[PDB]
């Protein structure tokens, strides 16, 4: 476990006397075995730093050493080599002693990205794309080491610049024709968001946000849809916990790309990745102490609901992962508050437009409750979505009231649809269902109450409020009110039968 079989390594150990073959040894490093390396890799790192504080004037050696360490870390990525990382970070954060190397390293990266069209530099590029996370971690450590060693950076600004220009070269690669490096472009988008949680330390988070923003617009906007979605997933994942000052600026970009995903009619395959976004975004929104988001959920509401309803009427087919999108929209309006329904979801364009939107939503709810997308074993989340339907459909009852009694002296037909939903929802989850156990009864009751009670009371009181237009309704609507009157409970049945006498007197 100490004995080593290699000449390149050993000569580099006394590179101080092998000051000549440093170039040669470096040219010979690409075939040094991983086992040969791992024994004293950190020691190679220290010798490497000695080289870089001394012989930086051989920026040829900067390239060579750079690719050598990239080869080292790419080696380290393997399952055979996942295990040294504790030693790695220990050295990086206890014995790493490089101060200005990070400048040189970012510099070499910028060279490589600049010289990207060269096929000989392509693989060095792509390997660096793989190792970006460690590369940046080391550049962080070297930079902050320079910082403490010098107290502060008189020129940290030009460092931030280094970041920006390097980003710009990246941007123009994405502007460059795809056929050059389509693979490495995907690899880029994949591995860049690694660096951001380390960018946190030494940077303006808003600037990083807008950086990746510009990056995203730089995409050829008919390519790498799955790839870009996974990338932006890794973005939304991290540093969105540092919410307010990246949320607000990333978010519009996020909506742009997902709404491009919305309706192009090539949209069909990305469904999965769109679902991941939709999910992660709003669930971290519900992640409590990330910050205040009611406005933010408000925005997402505004410009994604009619969208997603259309979507899942198109995602309609039961066989696919439609249910995931269901989870999305429910959780949405679950978190999202009544106020926000009132905000603009109440406040759409010319009235008949919102009327059409509502009728679509209702016939969707009918498509949901009838033919639930669930195997009846997820009754937990099933009951929950019952709750959110309860709440949302309530709020829709109130909007239809506040805008659609005889103040709108007319336009009273849609309520047939309405009450169909009202009952069809009411038309399951009955006494025998809880009867599966007493535990089943009481679990449902304690956790949830008896939703049927207030469902009935809502239909009841809105029936009262329906006004003398009831005459337009009775003979048709008499169907459903028997289901509710037949409801196996006691109370709401007592509150429900009088409806008979009510339209009895109206007629």
Sequential DSSP letters for 235-262: HHHSSSSS-HHHHHHHHHHHHHHHHHTT
Distance, in Å, from the CA atom of 479 to the CA atom of 253, rounded to the nearest integer, reads: 49
C-beta neighbour count of 375 within 10 angstroms? 9
Torsion of CA 35, 38, 40, 42, to 10 degrees: 160
Please identify which residue in the block is written with the tokens 């008896």.
Answer: 450
Method in brief: cryo-EM
The three-point CA angle 255-260-264 to 5° equals: 155
Helix, strand, coil % (nearest 5) of the chain? 75, 0, 25
What letter would DSSP give residue 3? -
How far is the CA of 419 from the CAs of 338, 358, 498, in angstroms? Answer: 21, 13, 17
Resolution (A): 4.7
Distance of CA 505 to the CA centre of its chain: 56
Which residue, 85, 99, 73, 283, is CA-closest to 191? 73
CB 18 within 8 A of CB 11: yes
Among 256, 292, 291, which residue's Cα sits nearest to residue 277? 256
In Å, how far from its chain's centre is CA 79?
Answer: 28
156-175 and 101-114 are packed helices; what angle lies between their axes, rounded to 10 degrees?
20
CA distance 250 to 253: 5
Cα distances (angstroms) measured from residue 270 to each of 77, 273, 456, 490: 29, 5, 41, 50
Tokens of 434: 């809880």
Contact indicator for 84, 41 with CB cutoff of 8 Å? yes
Burial group, residue 29, by CB count within 10 angstroms (0-12, 13-18, 19+): buried
Question: Helices 41-54 & 59-76, crossing angle to 10 degrees?
Answer: 160
**158: Cβ–Cβ under 8 A, 6 or more apart, which residues?**
none
Rounded-to-integer distance, Cα 284 and Cα 279, Å = 9
3-state secondary structure string across 21-82: CHHHHHHCHHHCCHHHHHCCHHHHHHHHHHHHHHCCCCHHHHHHHHHHHHHHHHHHCCHHHC
Q: Which residues contact 123 (CB under 8 A, 6 or more apart)?
A: none
For residue 114 the two structure tokens come to 């600049």
Q: Note every long-range contact of 272-276, with CB atoms under 8 Å and residues 24 or more positions apart, other chains counting.
A: 272/321, 272/324, 273/225, 273/226, 273/229, 273/230, 273/233, 274/229, 275/321, 275/324, 275/325, 275/328, 276/229, 276/230, 276/233
Residue whose tokens read 């939503």:
361
């Amino acid at each position: 476990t100490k004995l080593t079989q290699n000449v390149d390594l050993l000569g580099l150990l006394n590179w101080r006397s092998n000051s000549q073959n440093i170039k040669h040894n470096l040219k010979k490093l690409m075939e040094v075995d991983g086992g040969e390396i791992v024994k004293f890799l950190q020691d190679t790192l220290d010798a490497l730093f000695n080289i870089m504080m001394e012989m930086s004037d051989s920026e040829t050696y900067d390239f060579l050493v750079f690719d050598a360490l990239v080869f080292i870390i790419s080696l380290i990525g393997d399952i055979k080599f996942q295990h040294f990382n504790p030693v790695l970070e220990t050295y990086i954060y206890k014995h790493f002693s490089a101060t200005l190397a990070y400048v040189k390293l970012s510099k070499v990266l910028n060279f490589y990205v600049a010289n990207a069209d060269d096929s000989s530099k392509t693989e060095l590029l792509f390997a660096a794309l793989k190792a970006l996370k460690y590369l940046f971690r080391f550049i962080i450590q070297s930079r902050v080491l320079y910082l403490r060693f010098y107290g502060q950076s008189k020129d940290g600004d030009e460092f931030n610049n280094s970041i920006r220009q390097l980003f710009l070269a990246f941007n123009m690669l994405m502007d460059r024709p795809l056929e050059e490096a389509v693979k490495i472009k995907g690899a880029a988008l994949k591995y860049l968001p690694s660096i951001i949680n380390d960018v946190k330390l030494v940077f303006d988070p808003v600037e990083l946000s807008v950086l990746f923003c510009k990056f995203i617009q730089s995409i050829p906007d008919n390519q790498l849809v799955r790839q870009k979605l996974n990338c932006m997933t890794k973005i939304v994942e991290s540093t969105l916990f540092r919410q307010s000052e990246c949320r607000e600026v990333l978010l519009p970009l996020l909506t742009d790309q997902l709404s491009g995903q919305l309706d192009d009619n090539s949209n069909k395959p990305d469904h999965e990745a769109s679902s991941q976004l939709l999910s992660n975004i709003l669930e971290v929104l519900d992640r409590k102490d990330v910050g205040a988001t009611a406005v933010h959920i408000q925005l997402i509401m505004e410009r994604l609901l009619r969208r997603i309803n259309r979507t899942v009427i198109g995602m309609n087919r039961q066989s696919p992962h439609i249910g995931s999108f269901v989870a999305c929209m429910i959780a949405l309006l679950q978190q999202m508050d009544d106020s926000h329904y009132s905000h603009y979801i109440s406040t759409f364009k010319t009235r008949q437009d919102i009327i059409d939107f509502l009728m679509e939503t209702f016939i969707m709810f009918k498509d949901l409750i009838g033919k639930n997308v669930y195997a009846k074993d997820w009754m937990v989340m099933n009951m929950t979505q019952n709750r959110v339907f309860l709440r949302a459909i309530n709020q829709f009852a109130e909007v239809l009231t506040r805008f659609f009694m005889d103040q709108a002296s007319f336009e009273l037909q849609l309520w047939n649809n309405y009450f169909h939903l009202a009952v069809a929802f009411l038309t399951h989850e009955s006494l025998q269902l809880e009867t599966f156990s007493q535990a089943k009864r009481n679990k449902i009751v304690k956790k949830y109450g008896d939703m049927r009670k207030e469902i009935g009371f809502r239909i009841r009181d809105m029936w009262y409020n329906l006004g003398p237009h009831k005459i337009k309704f009775i003979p048709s609507m008499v169907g459903p009110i028997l289901e509710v009157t037949l409801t196996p409970e006691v109370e709401l049945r007592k509150a429900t039968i009088p409806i008979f006498f009510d339209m009895m007197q109206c007629e």
